């Protein structure tokens, strides 16, 4: 009298790995309804210890943990949004230009002028409606400019 | 040349500004030497077992605020829950939160703490019987033995599929939860290498301590006997299965479910390992595989409350036909051997499946559910120098999960293009890597053609 | 979606999806019609009847038999049968699956061309195939080489198959199947002279062929026992009515296979045909076939055939070399089972006919495209 | 690293590293392909087959034979064979070793030029050499002077070699090898008239050539015994199937070597060719060769050849002077063994072709550079 629950068309004696697909498949289907959320988790250490990093498996785990090639994927995006006010609060320097704050210049305008000195591009940058968008390299070069110019 | 101190102190891998792996890695290592816990990419947080005391838990942050959407607050897994709630609260369709690798201590500890934060959600919702984490703990030790496995590179690691669900008739204090039934790896019963060991239940029970069962089991305390069992490594030196037996007792008694059934139940597994002994023989002028007449079969008969001859005739040359009814005879040695292994495996499977019914019912409540939040343990991929198909298949499933990750991000990011006025110059990541799976999958499956052929 | 196979190996007709162990149900391919004025006005008149429905209804119905000698006699009748089978048993629509067809080998093109023409036009069906019996017989029996004997309801076969290839010259094909034997039976039976001739009366014999037959071990010696004993003689009822009791008339029947004098022909019989067809085929292979010898379906059901066959081969073989035969339990189903296997493998996706070709070229497509 | 040698002396093909005593394994250089529609759809179709794999598979395969008369017939087929041999037996990559090639002497340049061209281009291989059979035969037999007879699968040879030098004018080269003899065998065999002609059927004879042959001591006297006795006659099975029993038809076969009437040619035979080729060569040396007389490979396997050869030379020699012949056990392997020795000595490092030359000049390099 285990046996009733022991006991109880798609296939018979067959399809076996595909059955294992099927088992996943239903799950995947139902998950499609959902919003998923995400955590990826690591032993950085040789061990579970206060003792320090062991790198290489952490490398490969991160290879196994999508963020790495996810970020590969995303860099094509120029996957990047940086806010007007801070950004310009750094960046105005090369324009050496006074036109009043507020919307005499947008950030967009101030860009178009500084870019007019510096760059015309889509790929290195494009405008966003409130925040600003870049090739990874670009912020890097931006502040490279900033230290170089301010030091001189 | 590398993203400078501005980048260097940021919260986010997510907001990268230079892409080569070492950047990410060292920087998070800088968090680590800062001990700075919570790390972000995708839109989501990435986790390390700190291996030390810290009162991360202490409610000053945890209770006092819900907190904030991502940019707005210090990184914390508490966030992900928090905002998933308020998201669902308005949205009112379900969400699960997905937690990868980490296959031993921190994985489980943090899952615990996840439900702890579920308790914090309960406290947020309302406030005025195992504790609900402790209720999951009720499952944990037995289930942990139950589907843990040993990797060459991991020592208690579990190759069931479990999925964890939590269910709301309530948006009050908290409402009750499921843990659920997902891909299970039958083939492990088929095979081990001599370095490697078996579904832990077996290894655990088969230790010596419980004096009555071993003969009640119709078993020798020797693993060595059961070649189908024996295939593995003969011990793990210092995982102490006498006490682990005692823990199994502790849980099964905590079941509040009957001794007689549960003993018969693991005894089923005993029968299963007895089946490894069953071995058939092929006669002159004849192809059939044919019996060793064996106390093993008599043990089976006893435990089953079948008779052995019933096995001998009715299985060992089967009958199937309906509309008239007709008989099946002469199986090959391989046919027999495979067949019986299949049966045994399916039976183990079934037994797991049964565990659902009552275990959950102990969990299960006439408190309603409208809506659902969920937990998963593993997108499990690991490497060995040497490989076997099933593992690769699970890896396939892992990348499939990554399809799911990618195309959701694809959609959402396109929404972010919309957000500040901008037009998509990028195509489905879900599709793009799905093509890589598609090499594995056509209406022809790779797996499909293998098993097919 | 999913894939479905018709067996039209004659006798009861077998149909089932890929991967089921056995077809859902099975039907004789009897067709029958009324014989008498319909005199219950309350009755609905249906003018044609098929299947176990008819098998019940038989008495005033009279039978037509839509396959002679494995050749299907009358197409529209088939279409009736076929339609019925889909809708009544299968609850299936022609679009639903690829469909696989089961053929006597080496027989006139017409069956190919009309069968395909009808089933693509009258039914409209994703993919079509027609396959030769022996291939299935090997796949089910799972030995890539072999020779098969399967003498069904219909025309009776020898094919050696070597692994992965056909020897169509090698092949022998015979109209000796059990039906005609049974009709000879009556010309036996009048000796005891309980005697009846009509189609249904003829099918009544089929039961006796199930129950009462067994294979002669040795003909002379059997006659000697026939003189000695009545244990050779067994007592059997009419399906309803009398008890009937039958002598050598049981065992004499199968010998026709070994000696088709009794309804008289020359082809030197199953076994001598087989060894002949061997001696056609080349020298080295032969041992394998001496090892791998395979039999199936309607006649083979009889207990003992394999034994006297082996006796015969030991006569004809040089005794020096190993001999055995295979006699699986399930032979009568074997074909459709093999068909299921045949259905399973993705390669037919490469291989099926599609509607498109039938659009772009005729029935002619088949005869290149299939064997 | 280490150095590897292919034997492409025809018949089974022999390959092995320097310093192993015997090649790792050996393959016929049969090539064969399907003959029949492939009718197990489950089967993978491979369209070409070689080696013992084919030797098993033969029956539906049909053979091509890529070397006639020691001349290799079809290059791409060779390339198939060659590739297979490396990867399947040898688990070897073309870079791995110098490689040494084994050649019929005095035969058309083309084999040199394409062989080298392919193997430097298609394979890419540190060092290449092609060497004439007799040289190896001496090295293995270890007498610096000599004359060699080795009639393999392929074209049949006389070379006197004196110590350290060639006499290319002296040399005689004949297409009389055992294969063609065997095909004559069938024209014998129809006398008893158990009769079969195809390639595999022809190779079946090879076994009989192993087992059943022996050399006529005296032809007339043998005929007299043939009239007297049946001990001359022995009983042998088909590889499977019948027992077969064979008369003078065994011993008559080798006589063809002495009398190539039976498949009819004029060259006055092995022995008379040899003495002819001697009488070409100069006067003083001759005694040494009368002493040093050496034989190998396929035909020589037969028991007794050396004896009747000596009888023949005692006919043709002035009896006054010593005569003997060498008949080593290992002759069929001899060539590759000698090749191993040839591989051993560092001087080929001076001597190998290198890729560089093949870069800087054509196949033409060989014909200066090698013999
Ligand atoms: N129980 C039985 N014993 C012996 N013969 C039978 C039995 N049942 C059916 N048969 C015979 O087997 C055949 C069934 O048709 P089948 O073998 O499928 O022919 P086909 O090879 O054309 O498909 C018929 O000849 C039928 O009379
Ligand atoms: N056991 C045997 N007895 C006599 N002849 C044999 C035997 N085995 C092989 N041979 C013959 O010897 C030859 C083998 O080829 P081989 O002598 O290597 O030729 P090649 O000189 O071209 O390398 C073939 O003619 C084959 O038929």
Tab-separated table of C-alpha atoms and ligand atoms in Angstrom, chain C residues 7-14 65 70 133 150-155 157 177-179 182 206-211 213 296-302 332 335, ligand 1:
chain	number	residue	atom	x	y	z
C	7	UNK	CA	-0.030	-1.108	-41.577
C	8	UNK	CA	-1.692	-2.434	-44.705
C	9	UNK	CA	-0.072	-5.794	-44.494
C	10	UNK	CA	-3.154	-7.834	-45.150
C	11	UNK	CA	-5.302	-9.525	-42.619
C	12	UNK	CA	-6.360	-7.328	-39.776
C	13	UNK	CA	-5.056	-3.825	-40.275
C	14	UNK	CA	-2.764	-2.104	-37.847
C	65	UNK	CA	-12.202	-9.076	-49.983
C	70	UNK	CA	-1.502	-8.838	-51.601
C	133	UNK	CA	8.179	-5.413	-45.117
C	150	UNK	CA	6.655	-13.759	-43.543
C	151	UNK	CA	3.600	-15.357	-45.074
C	152	UNK	CA	0.714	-13.276	-43.920
C	153	UNK	CA	-2.820	-13.039	-45.026
C	154	UNK	CA	-1.072	-12.169	-48.282
C	155	UNK	CA	1.658	-13.006	-50.746
C	157	UNK	CA	8.052	-13.687	-49.187
C	177	UNK	CA	-0.686	-17.369	-48.153
C	178	UNK	CA	-2.942	-18.898	-45.568
C	179	UNK	CA	-6.214	-17.762	-47.119
C	182	UNK	CA	-7.805	-22.359	-45.997
C	206	UNK	CA	-9.529	-19.003	-39.306
C	207	UNK	CA	-10.414	-19.775	-35.700
C	208	UNK	CA	-9.570	-23.424	-36.247
C	209	UNK	CA	-6.328	-22.267	-37.809
C	210	UNK	CA	-5.665	-20.462	-34.570
C	211	UNK	CA	-6.640	-23.308	-32.314
C	213	UNK	CA	-3.216	-26.518	-36.205
C	296	UNK	CA	7.186	-13.824	-38.886
C	297	UNK	CA	3.425	-13.417	-39.084
C	298	UNK	CA	0.442	-15.366	-40.129
C	299	UNK	CA	1.624	-18.846	-40.968
C	300	UNK	CA	4.551	-18.777	-38.589
C	301	UNK	CA	2.155	-18.621	-35.642
C	302	UNK	CA	1.868	-22.393	-35.901
C	332	UNK	CA	2.362	-11.056	-36.278
C	335	UNK	CA	5.882	-5.292	-38.989
E	1	LIG	N1	-4.160	-17.323	-34.167
E	1	LIG	C1	-3.709	-17.527	-35.424
E	1	LIG	N2	-3.035	-18.643	-35.761
E	1	LIG	C2	-2.581	-18.840	-37.008
E	1	LIG	N3	-2.753	-17.974	-38.017
E	1	LIG	C3	-3.426	-16.824	-37.813
E	1	LIG	C4	-3.941	-16.521	-36.475
E	1	LIG	N4	-4.545	-15.325	-36.549
E	1	LIG	C5	-4.420	-14.895	-37.826
E	1	LIG	N5	-3.736	-15.778	-38.563
E	1	LIG	C6	-3.426	-15.633	-39.991
E	1	LIG	O1	-2.369	-14.690	-40.112
E	1	LIG	C7	-2.640	-13.780	-41.172
E	1	LIG	C8	-2.932	-12.400	-40.606
E	1	LIG	O2	-2.600	-11.440	-41.602
E	1	LIG	P1	-1.067	-10.956	-41.693
E	1	LIG	O3	-0.159	-12.045	-41.190
E	1	LIG	O4	-0.988	-9.610	-41.022
E	1	LIG	O5	-0.834	-10.841	-43.281
E	1	LIG	P2	0.137	-9.766	-43.976
E	1	LIG	O6	1.503	-10.394	-43.942
E	1	LIG	O7	-0.446	-9.608	-45.355
E	1	LIG	O8	0.042	-8.547	-43.106
E	1	LIG	C9	-3.822	-14.385	-41.903
E	1	LIG	O9	-3.368	-15.358	-42.843
E	1	LIG	C10	-4.580	-15.040	-40.767
E	1	LIG	O10	-5.434	-16.088	-41.229
